[PDB]
């Protein structure tokens, strides 16, 4: 019942519209389109996979303005972001140009989608290390000093203590 995307588009008709959703695996599926109040169309998809999905929306075979759109899915209402924990120096303080490292423990949440975002005065390079011990290593490097926000989400819900505010100094 969540409208994964809504589009207000005048003087089209639903029977000539198509909404094709591509999942992260590359699988495509046809989304359900329903017309709400106004000419506001609700596009709904029941996802089998977590992560950002793409939707192409066409009227009479032509992309609408904005297409392709994307949307993210989750959470599922079953737990579970609250069972993930993250910690380490890279969530406390860092230095510009120097890998800021931390771990994420995801084993209690089980299967899903883990998103790591870093926001601030430069673009982060992010590294992921799968470990066979139930934990993930993450590292990021940012070029510019400043306050960064580091977000860790499971199925698009922030885990405990996310977002982390991280002061990044010039190296010393």
């Amino acid at each position: 019942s969540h409208c994964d995307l809504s589009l207000k588009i005048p003087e089209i008709s639903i029977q000539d519209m198509t909404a094709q959703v591509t999942s992260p695996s590359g699988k495509t599926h046809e989304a359900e389109i329903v017309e709400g109040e106004n000419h506001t169309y609700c596009i709904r998809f029941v996802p089998a996979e977590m992560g950002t999905h793409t939707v192409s929306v066409k009227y009479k075979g032509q992309h609408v303005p904005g297409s392709p759109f994307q949307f993210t899915v989750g959470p599922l209402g079953e737990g579970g972001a609250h069972k993930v924990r993250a910690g380490g120096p890279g969530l406390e303080r860092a230095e510009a140009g120097v890998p800021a490292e931390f771990s994420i423990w995801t084993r209690e949440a089980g299967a899903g989608g883990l998103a790591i975002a870093v926001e601030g005065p430069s673009k982060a390079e992010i590294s992921f290390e799968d470990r066979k011990d139930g934990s993930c290593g993450v590292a990021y490097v940012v070029q510019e000093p400043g306050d960064y926000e580091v977000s860790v989400k499971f199925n698009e819900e922030h885990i405990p203590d996310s977002p982390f505010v991280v002061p990044v100094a010039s190296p010393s």
């Binding site: 996979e49 992560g51 995801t106 299967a111 790591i116 673009k123």
Partner: peptide
């Protein structure tokens, strides 16, 4: 004071 986003997603498998 410019602010940019960088984000990565990981598919987590059943344990």
């Amino acid at each position: 004071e410019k602010r940019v986003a960088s984000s990565v997603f990981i598919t987590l498998a059943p344990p």
